[PDB]
Amino acid sequence: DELYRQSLEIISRYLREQATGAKDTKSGATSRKALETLRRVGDGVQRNHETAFQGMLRKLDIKNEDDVKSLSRVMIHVFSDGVTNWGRIVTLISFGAFVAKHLKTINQESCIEPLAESITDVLVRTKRDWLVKQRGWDGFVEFFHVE
C-alpha cells in the first residue's frame, strides 16, 4: 500500500519533528515537498488557533500515547458532513502535532506512532479514492503552493 506507506511516512515525520523539536536526515520527491508544505502550513494553523487547540486538547482529555480512540471519532465526525478538502486534512494533522507535543511534555518517551497511525488510518481508509483522484500528496502540495 504505497499511498498508506507514503501518508504515514509524511505524517509520522511531521509529528516526530513537532514533538521532539528535531528533524530527521533519512521516493521522497513529493514526500519531502509534502513535508515542507506541512511544516509551513501546519505551523500557520497552529500559530493563529493556539487558544482553540488548547481548548480542544483539554476537552479531548488525552490519558497516554495509546489513547487515540477519541481523536479518531473526532476525525470521523469532522468528515461526516460529506465535505472533503485539504484545509480540513491539514488542520487535523496540524492538531495531531499539537497533541503529540503535549504527550512529550507529560512523559518525554512516548512513541507518537499510535497517533500518526490513527490519523493516517482515518485519512487513507475513509478518503482513499478521493486522495487517489488527485495523485495523492501532489494534490496537497499544489493546493498549498505559494509563489
Binding site: 502550513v41 480542544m56 469532522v78 484545509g87 488542520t91
Partner: peptide, 23 residues
Amino acid sequence: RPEIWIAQELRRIGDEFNAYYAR
C-alpha cells in the same frame, strides 16, 4: 457533546484554511 464541540472547531478552522488557499 465534548467530541462534537472539538469536531466543529476543527471543521471551522479547516474550512477557513481551505477558503484562504483556494483564492
